[PDB]
């Protein structure tokens with residue numbers, strides 16, 4: 001289709017992210033003198049059909065706050081997925097290293113509004129993310145934030161995905177039903193979004209600070225939740241706590257979350 005391009009159109013530069021995102025490189029699309037990001041598969045980091053399906057799914061995603069596909073090379077190996085390049089890197093590092101007078105309260109609402117917009121689109125389009133976290137949000141100039149869209153799964157909005165036996169999760173971002181039963185849904189993405197809000201509010205602190213990973217689930221089942229961060233508006237914390245309702249059904253939708261943030265951003 002229209003997305004297929006010649007591999008030789010791109011010149012590969014260096015690895016991005018220190019391996020955390022797999023085989024991803026900065027590159028140059030020569031014709032346009034345009035920096036792009038390129039993911040490939042040469043070191044057996046995923047299975048071939050999984051990679052090719054990622055590429056297929058990306059073709060369907062079109063939203064201002066989801067990383068945008070530019071093209072693919074899927075005829076013969078090595079296969080490539082080519083996307084827009086986000087200049088800063090990830091939101092976790094961005095928050096940690098930023099000048100807070102610039103990245104101020106208004107900007108944190110702006111960030112939350114952008115990410116919730118992306119998630120509202122995935123909710124509407126029957127996809128789940130499964131790894132929402134600041135390390136998986138990418139930042140460009142002027143505090144533009146886009147959710148990374150590797151790993152998306154198709155799932156009708158009211159259904160559940162069961163992860164493979166033996167799967168290991170990022171415990172501190174993982175909903176209780178996922179931890180206990182390997183069950184994921186758009187509502188487990190909502191849970192993760194609440195943790196992300198806490199990351200934003202703390203300018204990138206590690207969640208459940210000092211708490212043993214093997215005791216996180218136990219704390220959640222006893223109704224422990226992280227306290228409100230310093231400076232965090234009460235309405236924002238209310239939203240975070242709603243994202244952390246034990247029962248998935250009781251958590252807000254992304255459409256509701258995005259509306260709340262848009263309003264707070266517009267009124268700031």
Ligand SMILES: Cc1cc(Nc2ncc3cc(-c4c(Cl)cccc4Cl)c(=O)n(C)c3n2)ccc1F
Pocket residue numbers: 016017021024025037038039058067081082083084085086087088089090138147148149150
């Ligand atoms: C300075 C710096 C910049 C970036 N930018 C960046 N821009 C675009 C992309 C696009 C990726 C992508 C791809 Cl190539 C294929 C499918 C889905 C996605 Cl999301 C992606 O995995 N990454 C990490 C990525 N990183 C990352 C780290 C860093 F230190």
